Design a protein around this ligand. Structure first.
Ligand SMILES: [Mg+2]
Ligand SMILES: [Mg+2]
Ligand SMILES: [Mg+2]
Ligand SMILES: [Mg+2]
Length: 247
């Protein structure tokens, strides 16, 4: 496990916080990082994001040991099952129909992390020289950027800029993206909702994290930066320190 902390804020421009997440431990104290952005454009976004977070917490705490070679399958299978359960929970309740959430999550190992992603929340690794986004946004504007139809600068003002193209809960099937990332030579692992990176640029995050400070120092400063940039969304992230391999 890593030293890690969860940070969330409703933001100045939202009535409710539909983001969710947490840092959970299984029976041998392995660590699972979870972050979910519940959909505000649809009903009951906080129900959906906390449904997925609660399910991942309960399922992970019931495990004794998930070794690195089992992690991709554990995450893929549990995300698919949770999506299935959430879809039918929504179908069975008219006030929830259409609800959904992103999910980015990470199982932590000594030398690596295994990440699953559905939606436009993000995972990054950062060191003093670079910041690498591990995940790829399942968003309509990312589709437009990757197919050459708009520039990445246009995506921030596009009328469909908040639309996402893979979401938990909205269909009985989902295909999460799975990533394995070696942690060697990185300093921080960051999971975040788009309320952060829609308003704070990658190089701003890198510059903040290369400064001295504890995880709580960095997280409070990073949260204040998103708010100073007038984020119009809920802002949530987990910041985790990667321990340099000792001599
Ligand atoms: Mg949301
Ligand atoms: Mg977005
Ligand atoms: Mg370093
Ligand atoms: Mg959001």
């Amino acid at each position: 496990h890593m030293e890690a902390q969860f940070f969330t804020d409703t933001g100045q421009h939202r009535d409710k916080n539909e983001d969710a997440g947490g840092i959970f431990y299984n029976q041998t104290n392995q660590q699972l990082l979870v972050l979910c952005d519940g959909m505000g454009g649809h009903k009951a976004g906080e129900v959906a994001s906390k449904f997925v977070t609660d399910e991942l917490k309960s399922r992970f705490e019931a495990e004794n040991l998930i070794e690195q070679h089992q992690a991709e399958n554990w995450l893929r299978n549990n995300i698919k099952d949770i999506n299935f359960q959430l879809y039918h929970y929504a179908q069975e309740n008219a006030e929830y129909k259409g609800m959904g959430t992103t999910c980015v999550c990470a199982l932590v190992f000594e030398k690596s992390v295994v990440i699953a992603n559905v939606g436009d929340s993000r995972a990054y690794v950062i060191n003093s020289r670079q910041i690498e986004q591990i995940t790829s946004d399942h968003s309509f504007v990312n589709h437009l950027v990757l197919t050459g139809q708009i520039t990445p600068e246009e995506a921030f003002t596009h009328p469909q800029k908040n639309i996402i193209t893979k979401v938990m809960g909205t269909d009985k099937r989902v295909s999460p993206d799975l990533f394995i990332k070696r942690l060697n030579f990185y300093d921080y692992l960051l999971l975040n909702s788009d309320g952060l990176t829609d308003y704070v640029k990658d190089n701003e995050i890198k510059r903040l994290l290369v400064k001295e400070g504890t995880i709580e120092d960095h997280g409070d400063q990073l949260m204040q930066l998103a708010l100073d940039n007038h984020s119009k969304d809920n802002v949530t992230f987990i910041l985790a320190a990667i321990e340099g391999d000792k001599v």
